[PDB]
Design a protein around this ligand. Structure first.
Ligand code: HEM
Ligand code: PLM
Length: 407
């Protein structure tokens, strides 16, 4: 077969589901670079993808991703009891009280940032979200962050996810940002261990700095740094979902009124933003043993990718996936495989995102502020979603004018 890397990079969110549509199947064999790859979509495929007796992650992460988005030595590259033990470290951070604490810090940072937006007269909403998120998450995680460094650190965290997938010098910026953020986070871990930094016992940086592995050993400082960045970075990446919240409010008739007056609506709305909008395209794993599934061969070692966007738009599951309809979540049964914007399966026993509770809480803050507190004008602009960009965004970044919060 031919190499389809270029076709995938040209349409990273939709390539798999479009090919599935042409072939009338939920899976097809392709090739990306040197690797034959089985591409999978839909709930049944997701359930097999999360079977850890058939799939492993070790060695599946490309070097370019290790050098930008994820770092080296983090939980994403682990399998088995080594994985489960490291994953418990992240899961223990996510109590309802701690998630609420982060949401509260974020609301405060957003409110603190508004006067600056008012003074600018016109803002790119996406561009303005990274710093308040950075300030909130650093405070919550026990990471000291001087006021005069917050903007710089927010730009570095942003570069890890926003510039990683850019076929331009921006990718070089992402690589430098990774070197810088790893060094910074390592100084934080070192300071906590030496007693020069007094992060609290319930904070992420404390938990990670003092985590003991399965041999009762502390994580090496670099690995601890990477795991701390695995909390900070994706929290800043919620900027993308917050921008999509503003986009849905602007482009979908009836949503604003429903959010303002119906109190149970916000939970449905945020879930539908996660279902509808492209963000995390797909996940990669490797077959751990020979098997066949639905007439397709999965030889030991076969690279496999699971299409999250395509799964979230599977008409068999959703019936009318092309519409933005928060109401659809009234009928959801909380299946762990059929709605997978941040992965599928079980949080403890697999690689599913431990950040979902944070994401939902922060999205609800955003929805509340954009309809109940923050007044703004939206000038004529190109709001269409850029499906060629990683992460996807409205092409304009969502431009606002005359922003204020006294109204
Ligand atoms: C901003 C939107 C986010 C999206 C779209 C997202 C999506 C994902 C996805 C698709 C995965 C991989 C699932 C897999 O490998 O099977 C993942 C893993 C992960 N996410 Fe998120 N996530 C987000 C936010 C967060 C937040 C706020 C945190 C804060 C702790 C977080 C921490 C992690 C970690 C540590 C993993 C690796 C878990 C593991 O490998 O066991 N994420 N996320
Ligand atoms: C030069 C080729 C590399 C391509 C890199 C593609 C990476 C896709 C990342 C886009 C989604 C970003 C979501 C945030 C992820 C997180 O913070 O863990």
């Amino acid at each position: 077969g031919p190499d389809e890397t270029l076709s995938l990079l040209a349409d990273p969110y939709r390539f798999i589901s479009r090919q599935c549509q042409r072939l009338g199947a939920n899976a097809f064999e392709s090739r990306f670079l040197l690797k034959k790859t089985n591409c999978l979509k839909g709930a049944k495929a997701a359930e097999i993808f999360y079977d850890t007796t058939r799939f492993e992650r070790e060695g599946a992460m490309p070097v370019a991703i290790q050098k930008t988005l994820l770092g080296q030595g983090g939980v994403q590259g682990l399998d088995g009891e080594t994985h489960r033990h490291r994953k418990q470290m992240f899961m223990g951070l996510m109590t309802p009280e701690r998630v609420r604490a982060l949401a509260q810090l974020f609301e405060a940072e957003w409110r603190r940032a508004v006067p600056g937006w008012t003074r600018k007269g016109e803002i790119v909403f996406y561009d303005e979200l990274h710093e308040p998120l950075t300030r909130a998450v650093c405070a919550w995680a026990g990471v000291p962050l001087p006021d005069d460094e917050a903007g710089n650190r927010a730009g570095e965290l942003r570069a890890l996810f926003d510039a990683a997938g850019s076929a331009s010098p921006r990718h070089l910026w992402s690589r430098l940002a990774r070197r810088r953020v790893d060094a910074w986070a390592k100084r934080i871990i070192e300071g906590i261990r030496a007693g020069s930094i007094g992060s609290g016992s319930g904070t992420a940086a404390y938990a990670i700095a003092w985590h003991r592995d399965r041999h009762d050993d502390l994580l090496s400082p670099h690995v601890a740094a990477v795991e701390l960045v695995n909390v900070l970075r994706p929290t800043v990446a919620i900027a993308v979902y917050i921008t999509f919240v503003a986009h849905a409010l602007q482009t979908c008739s009836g949503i604003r009124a429903a959010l303002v007056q119906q109190p149970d609506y916000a939970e449905l709305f945020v879930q539908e933003v996660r279902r509808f909008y492209p963000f995390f395209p797909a996940v990669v794993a490797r077959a751990s043993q020979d098997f066949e599934w639905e007439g397709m061969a999965f030889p030991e070692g076969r690279q496999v990718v699971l299409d999250l966007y395509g799964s979230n738009h599977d008409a068999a599951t959703w019936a009318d996936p092309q519409e933005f309809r928060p109401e659809r979540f009234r009928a959801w049964d909380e299946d762990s495989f059929n709605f997978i914007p941040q992965g599928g399966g079980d949080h403890y026993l697999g690689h599913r995102c431990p950040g979902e509770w944070i994401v939902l809480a922060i999205m609800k803050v955003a929805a509340h502020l954009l309809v109940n507190a923050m007044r703004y004008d939206v000038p004529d602009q190109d709001l269409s979603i850029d499906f060629a960009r990683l992460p996807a965004l409205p092409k304009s970044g969502f431009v606002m004018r005359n922003v204020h919060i006294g109204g």
